[PDB]
Amino acid sequence: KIQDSLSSTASALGKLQDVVNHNAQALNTLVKQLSSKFGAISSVLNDI
Amino acid sequence: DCTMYICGDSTECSNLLLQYGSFCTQLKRALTGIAVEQDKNTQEVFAQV
Amino acid sequence: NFNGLKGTGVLTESNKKFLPFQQFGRDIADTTDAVRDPQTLEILDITPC
């Protein structure tokens, strides 16, 4: 029953996947944050 | 509402806040992560039967 | 430096098909990742060294 249950769906391992998804989302955000101007004339530093 | 907290009733301040952007979403998600956990806690404690 | 766009990296032959009205390509982090050369009209990728 265990083998077949893990053969049927991914959703049960959502507890280990959401740890992986939280680090992926935190780093993708930390990249997107470089898009911000913080009120300077430019986001990109060479354009200063 | 990060926008109504930071910027009281101003479209212009809402334009300025948009140069910061993803900060507001990161705070909203972080508070949503807590809000979901309160229900999980209550379910794990009481819904054992 | 391309058209005043200072930076440090390695240039490489792109595959990106910039339309005639386009001059710079980007990363999601808003940094230029590709450039159209101002004399031999072709697209170069940038990557930091």
Side-chain angles (χ1 to χ4, degrees):
Chain A
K1 296 279 288 291
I2 294 287
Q3 196 271 86
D4 280 18
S5 176
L6 297 180
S7 192
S8 186
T9 184
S11 57
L13 276 300
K15 204 190 306 297
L16 293 183
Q17 188 66 59
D18 76 11
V19 173
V20 174
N21 297 354
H22 287 313
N23 167 266
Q25 185 263 312
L27 294 180
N28 285 328
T29 302
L30 190 65
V31 180
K32 269 174 55 67
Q33 290 275 84
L34 300 180
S35 192
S36 316
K37 275 157 57 61
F38 298 92
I41 70 176
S42 177
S43 47
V44 53
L45 205 72
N46 299 328
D47 293 12
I48 294 159
Chain B
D1 176 353
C2 91
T3 77
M4 169 167 29
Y5 179 88
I6 292 173
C7 296
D9 56 290
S10 165
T11 192
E12 309 82 2
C13 188
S14 306
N15 299 166
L16 270 64
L17 197 170
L18 251 291
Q19 281 83 93
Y20 288 78
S22 192
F23 285 90
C24 175
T25 299
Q26 188 168 38
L27 275 79
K28 284 175 55 60
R29 183 185 305 270
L31 289 171
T32 303
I34 295 181
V36 173
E37 196 80 296
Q38 307 318 302
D39 288 333
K40 183 171 176 65
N41 280 10
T42 310
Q43 293 266 1
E44 171 58 18
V45 174
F46 292 103
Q48 295 208 308
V49 287
Chain C
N1 181 337
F2 288 74
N3 318 276
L5 184 81
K6 291 176 69 78
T8 293
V10 50
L11 298 308
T12 283
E13 297 287 2
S14 198
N15 304 330
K16 295 179 180 198
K17 299 177 183 180
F18 288 16
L19 288 172
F21 69 87
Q22 299 171 339
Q23 185 74 180
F24 305 109
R26 299 263 159 89
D27 189 13
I28 183 60
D30 202 21
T31 54
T32 53
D33 86 341
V35 63
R36 133 147 314 158
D37 180 89
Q39 304 186 332
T40 50
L41 276 289
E42 72 227 337
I43 309 309
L44 300 171
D45 296 330
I46 297 110
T47 291
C49 308

